[PDB]
Every structure is written in structure tokens, then in C-alpha cells.
Design a protein around this ligand. Structure first.
Ligand SMILES: CC(C)CCC[C@@H](C)[C@H]1CC[C@H]2[C@@H]3CC=C4C[C@@H](O)CC[C@]4(C)[C@H]3CC[C@]12C
Ligand SMILES: CC(C)CCC[C@@H](C)[C@H]1CC[C@H]2[C@@H]3CC=C4C[C@@H](O)CC[C@]4(C)[C@H]3CC[C@]12C
Ligand SMILES: CC(C)CCC[C@@H](C)[C@H]1CC[C@H]2[C@@H]3CC=C4C[C@@H](O)CC[C@]4(C)[C@H]3CC[C@]12C
Ligand SMILES: Cc1ccc(C(=O)Nc2nc(-c3ccco3)c(C(=O)C3CCOCC3)s2)cn1
Ligand SMILES: CCCCCCCC/C=C\CCCCCCCC(=O)OC[C@H](O)CO
Ligand SMILES: CCCCCCCC/C=C\CCCCCCCC(=O)OC[C@H](O)CO
Ligand SMILES: CCCCCCCC/C=C\CCCCCCCC(=O)OC[C@H](O)CO
Ligand SMILES: CCCCCCCC/C=C\CCCCCCCC(=O)OC[C@H](O)CO
Ligand SMILES: CCCCCCCC/C=C\CCCCCCCC(=O)OC[C@H](O)CO
Ligand SMILES: CCCCCCCC/C=C\CCCCCCCC(=O)OC[C@H](O)CO
Ligand SMILES: CCCCCCCC/C=C\CCCCCCCC(=O)OC[C@H](O)CO
Ligand SMILES: CCCCCCCC/C=C\CCCCCCCC(=O)OC[C@H](O)CO
Ligand SMILES: CCCCCCCC/C=C\CCCCCCCC(=O)OC[C@H](O)CO
Ligand SMILES: CCCCCCCC/C=C\CCCCCCCC(=O)OC[C@H](O)CO
Ligand SMILES: CCCCCCCC/C=C\CCCCCCCC(=O)OC[C@H](O)CO
Ligand SMILES: CCCCCCCC/C=C\CCCCCCCC(=O)OC[C@H](O)CO
Ligand SMILES: CCCCCCCC/C=C\CCCCCCCC(=O)OC[C@H](O)CO
Ligand SMILES: CCCCCCCC/C=C\CCCCCCCC(=O)OC[C@H](O)CO
Ligand SMILES: CCCCCCCC/C=C\CCCCCCCC(=O)OC[C@H](O)CO
Ligand SMILES: CCCCCCCC/C=C\CCCCCCCC(=O)OC[C@H](O)CO
Ligand SMILES: CCCCCCCC/C=C\CCCCCCCC(=O)OC[C@H](O)CO
Ligand SMILES: CCCCCCCC/C=C\CCCCCCCC(=O)OC[C@H](O)CO
Ligand code: NA
Length: 391
């Protein structure tokens, strides 16, 4: 078994490489939102909170990981802080990702209430509350749910640690019942399933609304055929069904003018039908075809286009949740094997290190997803790189 420092040097060089990239990419997300008022919306205040957490992975969590890989002597509680700090940043990340999912759900379910419900001031209060709770949840072991009462006495003597000191190793100070039941099941796995459920409700809500728009459009076009097939109470029933469906599409000016004309043309055809002038009502009904073209088809296409953008945007933010789950799951599955299967062989050291590195890599990927999938970030990223790196 080779000298530890050789494999130690690979791990550390890789961790520092990740730290550099996590800082630069996330500082760019923050710089972007700062410079571009098109990126200054409540969704992006949670994107910045998540960027801040990923900066703190590079500045603090990776230096801590490096430090704790040495097994240096420390007072147990100072060891606990170094061991648990990254759990604060993961919890802060779960909260930001959950808030973004709920924000997007509100934006698609009740867009007319969104601006009055989700403001900057409330979003900042929520972010502040979520950072407090993330410190409380991630440093719980420091409240006394910890192995500091039961030091490894053989490691403590072989490394020449002093009174009160331990060999600082994550798995010697953080209980696995905490890491599995409390950190994984309650604080990570339940919130990811909840976010899965909200994204499912966004995609369904979008699909039902696109359907309703296609449906309304088909009633008009269908009922034009029901009118144009020569009875007068027959035309009345088709016209009564188009007046419901014109209203339902409605429920500023270029917009609200098309529908005024439309209900105008329908009520005109209605008056003729009540009187009983079938032929007049049929001619009255063909004017509508022209109002459909120059107005109604424009509203429909615009409503479809907005919903499709919400679907694409919601796909992009869900890719970010998937990549979080992917990057952290291996470390959680390893703790689950350690806890639930004490007869199972432990993961080799090299694979522990790979699981840790994969977890840090999550703090690099988000800036790439914004660059690839969101025009406004991408364009802002060029302006900033062209100005400040080109020059
Ligand atoms: C503003 C930010 C950057 C400040 C960062 C402070 C960090 C580096 C400080 C705060 C608390 C500190 C720990 C507190 C106590 C101990 C126990 C001791 O036996 C070994 C050092 C150790 C483990 C310290 C390491 C450094 C530490 C983690
Ligand atoms: C929805 C998905 C992503 C959640 C992840 C499921 C996790 C919790 C599952 C997947 C594989 C599972 C492990 C598979 C095998 C064993 C061996 C057994 O002797 C103890 C339980 C243990 C260790 C399981 C614990 C739970 C486990 C880690
Ligand atoms: C999901 C993508 C990113 C790939 C990662 C897959 C994860 C789930 C795999 C990669 C290597 C795997 C580990 C490899 C070896 C062992 C030792 C054995 O005694 C128990 C299972 C355990 C601890 C495995 C658990 C699951 C594991 C961590
Ligand atoms: C047999 C064995 C040894 C070590 C471990 C172990 O270290 N699990 C571990 N799980 C996690 C974890 C985090 C989230 C879910 O899980 C770790 C870390 O994020 C540490 C990496 C170094 O900086 C200190 C934090 S460390 C588990 N089982
Ligand atoms: C989401 C997309 C992420 C995709 C990116 C891939 C993730 C892995 C990254 C780099 C590989 C680093 C390999 C080196 C890992 C450490 C291995 C090691 O140092 O060996 C330890 C030795 O055994 C101790 O004694
Ligand atoms: C640890 C290091 C982390 C650095 C953190 C944030 C920098 C990201 C930029 C955030 C913007 C702050 C405000 C600013 O500096 O902007 C100056 C400009 O002149 C006003 O228009
Ligand atoms: C390792 C350290 C990595 C660098 C970290 C922080 C400094 C980044 C400096 C850029 C911060 C952006 C400030 C800003 O927003 O400036 C707008 C201004 O108008 C345009 O010049
Ligand atoms: C240990 C170090 C941890 C890093 C701490 C803070 C990162 C910088 C985050 C501060 C926010 C900068 C971006 C910003 O302010 O843009 C949002 C804008 O205000 C919307 O209107
Ligand atoms: C704004 C950017 C600032 C970012 C800040 C960068 C931090 C400095 C870089 C690496 C620290 C590496 C951690 C030091 C680990 C030392 C391990 C140790 O102390 O070993 C004791 C010895 O093993 C007893 O026997
Ligand atoms: C902003 C602050 C940047 C760097 C200060 C942090 C430097 C970290 C260096 C740790 C030094 C150390 O741990 O030395 C151990 C001792 O000398 C053997 O027992
Ligand atoms: C890329 C820009 C980076 C920004 C500037 C930061 C430079 C820090 C350089 C090296 C950190 C390595 C620290 C070495 C600490 C580990 C010493 C050690 O391994 O302890 C002895 C033995 O392993 C006990 O078990
Ligand atoms: C923007 C602000 C930048 C802030 C930058 C912060 C970087 C933190 C660096 C290292 C973590 C601390 C490493 C802890 C080193 C412990 C060494 C120790 O305690 O040694 C005791 C004894 O020597 C055992 O043998
Ligand atoms: C600007 C930084 C502001 C506040 C950082 C306060 C963090 C204080 C560090 C808490 C961890 C600690 O003090 O550890 C206990 C000791 O190691 C066990 O004997
Ligand atoms: C944990 C986050 C759950 C709350 C998120 C709410 C949200 O995302 O929108 C902000 C607005 O203040 C909601 O009324
Ligand atoms: C250890 C790290 C602890 C602290 C880290 C980050 C604090 C959160 C910083 C990012 C919060 C974003 C706030 C914001 O951008 O709010 C704009 C406001 O809504 C306009 O009306
Ligand atoms: C906002 C902060 C909220 C919760 C942080 C809870 C973490 C408390 C960490 C305080 C440091 C501590 O507990 O010190 C250990 C002491 O040495 C015992 O022996
Ligand atoms: C929703 C999914 C999230 C958490 C599920 C929680 C399931 C937890 C059930 C675990 C029961 C268990 O493992 O206890 C057996 C004990 O270890 C034998 O002595
Ligand atoms: C928000 C909280 C929601 C669910 C908590 C789910 C956590 C459920 C974990 C089961 C705990 C348990 O059954 O523990 C028994 C014993 O320790 C055997 O190992
Ligand atoms: C100690 C254990 C703590 C562990 C941390 C667990 C986090 C769970 C917290 C909140 C879940 C929120 C439920 C999300 C369900 C969807 C809500 C929704 O759809 O809200 C729309 C409404 O219109 C809004 O105004
Ligand atoms: C176990 C995964 C099961 C998750 C999926 C279970 C719910 C599926 C579902 O409800 O499908 C959509 C339906 O249209 C609702 O209105
Ligand atoms: C959420 C996933 C729930 C997974 C719950 C897995 C519990 C497995 C378990 O209880 O293991 C058996 C026990 O260790 C006897 O050997
Ligand atoms: C040493 C280890 C180096 C650390 C960096 C490793 C991976 C992050 C690099 C960014 C790659 C993240 C995935 C990009 C992606 O999947 O985006 C495709 C996009 O959706 C198409 O339009
Ligand atoms: Na993160």
C-alpha cells in the first residue's frame, strides 16, 4: 500500500481545481444578475442564493474537506464544525431549489396574482430565514448529536493528540443515524421528492392550459361549420357556444379590441337568430372568420409561445435539481451502506474521495446550465467576458 501523500496530492490538486472553477462560475452568475435588470426578478434572487452557497463550497467547504482528509488532531467540536459546515450549504441549496420550484408553480397557476404575491422584499425575508434554518439543520451535531462523548482512543494515541482532542475524521465524529435518517431521509430526500412533485404539477398545469387554448380555438372553428351548414335555433345554439368560448379565452388595446369585435359580431348574429332571420345570422357569422385572422389567432399564438417558454424554463431548472441529486446521491448511498449493512465491506478510500469530488463538482455545473439553456444569462455572460476578459 503506497505512501498516502501521493494519492493525497491527486485528491487535493483535484479539489483545488474544482474550488477555482466553482468560485469563477458562480461569481459570474452574481455579476450577471447585478448588471442586467432583465435578470433582476425573484426567481433569480434564489439563483444568487444558490450561487453564494457554491462560492462558499470553493472558499470554505473544499479547504475543510482537504483539512479533514489529513486526520489532524483537533478538539472534537472544532472537528465537528469542519465536518458539518458543507451540510449548511447543501441545506441552503435544497431550500433555494425548493423556492424556485414553488415560484415557477405560482407563475404558471395564477400568473395574474404572481407579482402581488411573490415580491423582492418577501423573497429576501424567505432567503434570510432559509440561511438561518440551514445553519441550524447542518450544525445540529454540534448541539450534541455527535460521537465526541466516545472518542477513538487508539487513533488519539497513535497520532499523539492531546487531552480533549481527536483524530479529525468525518465518520468518527458525525453519527451515521444523523447522516442517514436526519440529513439524507428528512432534509435532502423528502425535499427532492417534493420538488419532483411541484415540477410534475408545473408540466401538467402547462399541458392543461395548452390543451384549453387549442380546444377554445377548435370550438370557434368547429361552430363556424355548425352555423355554415344550412334551422335558426340551430345557429343560436352554435352562437351561444362561441360567446361562452370567446369570453373564456378573454378570461391591453390591440388585444381587448379583437374580443370586443368578436362578441359584437356574435351578439349581432344572436339578435338576427332570435328574430329568426337564418340567412342574415349566417352572413353575420362569416365576418367573424376575418376577426379570427387579424386578432384572435395573434392572442392564441402569443399565449402558446409564453406557455412553451415556461415549459422550457421549468425543464432547465429541473435539470439543476437532477444534477444536485446525481452529484450528492453517491455519498448518501455510501452512508446508507455503512449504517444499515455493518457486515458489508466499506467503499475503498479512492472511491470515498471520488464521491466527495463528485459532490463538489455540483458547485461548478449550474453556471454551464444557465449558459446553455437561458439566453439572457448566456448573452450577459458574453458582454461580461468580451468587456472584462477580452479587455
Ligand atoms: C470569515 C470566514 C472565512 C472565517 C473562517 C473561519 C474558520 C477557518 C475557522 C472557524 C472555526 C475554526 C475551528 C475552531 C476550532 C478548531 C479546533 C482546533 O483543535 C483545531 C482548529 C479548529 C478545527 C478550527 C479550524 C478553523 C475554523 C474552522
Ligand atoms: C429515489 C432514490 C433516488 C432514493 C435513493 C434510495 C436509497 C435510499 C436506496 C438505494 C439502494 C439502497 C441500499 C441497497 C442495499 C442495501 C443493503 C442492505 O443490507 C441494507 C440496506 C441497503 C444499504 C439499501 C439502503 C437504501 C438504498 C441506499
Ligand atoms: C449515480 C451515478 C452518478 C454513479 C454512482 C453510483 C453509486 C450509487 C455507486 C458508485 C459506487 C458504488 C459503491 C461501490 C462499492 C460499495 C461497497 C459495497 O460493500 C457496498 C456498496 C458500495 C458502497 C457501492 C454503493 C453505490 C455506489 C456508491
Ligand atoms: C465507512 C465510511 C467512511 C467515511 C464516510 C463519510 O465520510 N461519509 C460522508 N458523507 C458526507 C456527506 C455529505 C452529505 C451526505 O453525505 C461527507 C462529507 O460531505 C464530508 C467530506 C469532507 O469534508 C467534510 C464533509 S463524508 C462514510 N462511511
Ligand atoms: C455533473 C458532471 C460531473 C462530471 C465530472 C466527473 C467527476 C469526477 C471529476 C474528476 C475526476 C478526479 C479523479 C481523481 C479522484 C481522486 C482519486 C484519488 O486521488 O486516489 C486516492 C488514493 O487512493 C488515496 O490514497
Ligand atoms: C469571496 C469572494 C466572493 C465575491 C462575491 C461577490 C462578487 C460578485 C459581484 C457582486 C456585485 C457586488 C456589487 C459590486 O461590486 O459592483 C460594483 C459596480 O461598480 C456597481 O455598479
Ligand atoms: C479567486 C477570486 C475570483 C474573483 C472573485 C471576485 C472578484 C470578481 C470581480 C468582479 C465583480 C463584479 C463587480 C460588478 O458587478 O461590476 C460591474 C461593473 O460595471 C463592471 O466593471
Ligand atoms: C465565504 C464567502 C461566501 C460568498 C458570499 C457571498 C457571495 C456573493 C453574494 C452577494 C450577492 C451579489 C449579487 C447581487 O447582489 O445581485 C443581485 C441583485 O441585487 C438583484 O437585484
Ligand atoms: C477569496 C479566495 C480565498 C480562498 C481561500 C483559500 C484557502 C487556502 C488554500 C488551501 C487551504 C488548504 C487547507 C489547509 C490544510 C492543512 C492541513 C493541516 O493542517 O495538517 C496538519 C498536520 O497534518 C498535523 O499532523
Ligand atoms: C484569507 C486567509 C487565507 C489564508 C489563511 C489560511 C492558511 C491555512 C494554513 C493552515 C496552516 C496549518 O494548518 O499548519 C499546521 C501546523 O503548522 C503543523 O502542525
Ligand atoms: C489555484 C490557486 C489556489 C489559491 C492559493 C492556495 C494555494 C494552496 C496550495 C496548496 C494547498 C495544500 C495544503 C497542504 C496541506 C496538507 C499537508 C498534509 O498533507 O499534512 C501531512 C500529512 O498528510 C498528515 O496526515
Ligand atoms: C474571502 C475570505 C477568505 C477566507 C479564507 C478561509 C480559508 C480557510 C482555510 C483553511 C481552513 C482551516 C484549516 C484548519 C487548519 C487546522 C490546523 C491545526 O489546527 O493544527 C493543530 C495541530 O497542528 C495538529 O497537529
Ligand atoms: C465573520 C465570521 C463571523 C462569525 C463566525 C463565527 C463562527 C465561530 C466558530 C464556531 C466553531 C467553534 O468555535 O468550535 C468550538 C471549539 O473548537 C471546541 O473546543
Ligand atoms: C423553502 C421555500 C418555500 C417558500 C418559497 C416561496 C417562494 O418561492 O416565493 C416567494 C413568495 O414570497 C411566496 O409568497
Ligand atoms: C456562509 C455563507 C453565508 C452567507 C451567504 C450568502 C448570503 C445570501 C446572499 C444572496 C442573497 C440574494 C439576495 C438578493 O439578491 O435580493 C435582491 C432583492 O430581492 C432586490 O429587491
Ligand atoms: C445562526 C446560528 C444558528 C445555529 C447555529 C448552531 C451552531 C452552534 C455552534 C457554536 C459553537 C459551539 O457550540 O462550541 C462548542 C463548545 O466548545 C462546546 O464544548
Ligand atoms: C418518503 C421517503 C423518505 C423517507 C422514508 C423513510 C423510511 C424509513 C424506514 C426505515 C426503517 C428502518 O430502517 O428501521 C429498521 C431498524 O434499523 C431495524 O432494527
Ligand atoms: C420533514 C420530515 C419528513 C419525514 C421524516 C422521515 C425520516 C424517517 C426515518 C426513520 C427513523 C427510524 O425508523 O429509526 C429507528 C432506528 O434508529 C433504526 O435504525
Ligand atoms: C427538521 C426537518 C426539516 C427538513 C426540511 C423539510 C422542508 C419542507 C418544508 C416545506 C415544504 C413546502 C411544501 C411544498 C408543497 C407545494 C406548495 C405549493 O404548491 O404552493 C403554492 C401556493 O399557491 C403558495 O402561495
Ligand atoms: C413512486 C413514484 C410515483 C410518482 C407518480 C405518481 C403520481 C402520478 C400522477 O398523478 O399522474 C398525473 C395525473 O394526471 C395527476 O393529475
Ligand atoms: C427512502 C428509502 C427507504 C429505504 C429504507 C431502507 C431500510 C433498510 C434497512 O432497514 O436495513 C435492514 C436492517 O439494517 C437489518 O439488517
Ligand atoms: C477536475 C474536474 C473538473 C470540474 C468541472 C467538471 C464538470 C463541470 C463542467 C460543466 C459541464 C456540466 C454539464 C453541462 C450540461 O450537461 O449542459 C448541456 C446543455 O443542457 C446543452 O444545451
Ligand atoms: Na449547491
Amino acid at each position: 500500500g503506497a505512501p498516502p501523500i501521493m494519492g493525497s496530492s491527486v485528491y487535493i490538486t483535484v479539489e483545488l481545481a474544482i474550488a477555482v472553477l466553482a468560485i469563477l462560475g458562480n461569481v459570474l452568475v452574481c455579476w450577471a444578475v447585478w448588471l442586467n435588470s432583465n435578470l433582476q426578478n425573484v426567481t433569480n434572487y434564489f439563483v444568487v442564493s444558490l450561487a453564494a452557497a457554491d462560492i462558499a463550497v470553493g472558499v470554505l467547504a473544499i479547504p475543510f474537506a482537504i483539512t479533514i482528509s489529513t486526520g489532524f488532531c483537533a478538539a472534537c467540536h472544532g472537528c465537528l464544525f469542519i465536518a458539518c459546515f458543507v451540510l449548511v450549504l447543501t441545506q441552503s441549496s435544497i431550500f433555494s431549489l425548493l423556492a424556485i420550484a414553488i415560484d415557477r408553480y405560482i407563475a404558471i397557476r395564477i400568473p395574474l396574482r404572481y407579482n402581488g404575491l411573490v415580491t423582492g422584499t418577501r423573497a429576501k425575508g424567505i432567503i434570510a430565514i432559509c440561511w438561518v434554518l440551514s445553519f441550524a439543520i447542518g450544525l445540529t451535531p454540534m448541539l450534541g448529536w455527535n460521537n465526541c462523548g466516545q472518542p477513538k482512543e487508539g487513533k488519539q494515541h497513535s497520532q499523539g493528540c492531546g487531552e480533549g482532542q481527536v483524530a479529525c475524521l468525518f465518520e468518527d465524529v458525525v453519527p451515521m443515524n444523523y447522516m442517514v435518517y436526519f440529513n439524507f431521509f428528512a432534509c435532502v430526500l423528502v425535499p427532492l421528492l417534493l420538488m419532483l412533485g411541484v415540477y410534475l404539477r408545473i408540466f401538467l398545469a402547462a399541458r392543461r392550459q395548452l390543451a384549453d387554448l387549442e380546444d377554445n380555438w377548435e370550438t370557434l372553428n368547429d361552430n363556424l361549420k355548425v352555423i355554415e351548414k344550412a334551422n335558426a335555433a340551430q345557429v343560436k345554439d352554435a352562437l351561444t357556444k362561441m360567446r361562452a368560448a370567446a369570453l373564456d379565452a378573454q378570461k391591453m388595446k390591440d388585444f381587448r379590441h379583437g374580443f370586443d369585435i368578436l362578441v359584437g359580431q356574435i351578439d349581432d348574429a344572436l339578435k338576427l337568430a332570435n328574430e329568426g332571420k337564418v340567412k342574415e345570422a349566417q352572413a353575420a357569422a362569416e365576418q367573424l372568420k376575418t376577426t379570427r385572422n387579424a386578432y384572435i389567432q395573434k392572442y392564441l399564438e402569443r399565449a402558446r409561445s409564453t406557455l412553451q417558454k415556461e415549459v422550457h424554463a421549468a425543464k432547465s431548472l429541473a435539470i439543476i435539481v437532477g444534477l444536485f441529486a446525481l452529484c450528492w446521491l453517491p455519498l448518501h448511498i455510501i452512508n446508507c451502506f455503512t449504517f444499515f449493512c455493518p457486515d458489508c465491506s466499506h467503499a475503498p478510500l479512492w472511491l470515498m474521495y471520488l464521491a466527495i469530488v463528485l459532490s463538489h463538482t455540483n458547485s461548478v455545473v449550474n453556471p454551464f446550465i444557465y449558459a446553455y439553456r437561458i439566453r439572457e444569462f448566456r448573452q450577459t455572460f458574453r458582454k461580461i467576458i468580451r468587456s472584462h476578459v477580452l479587455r
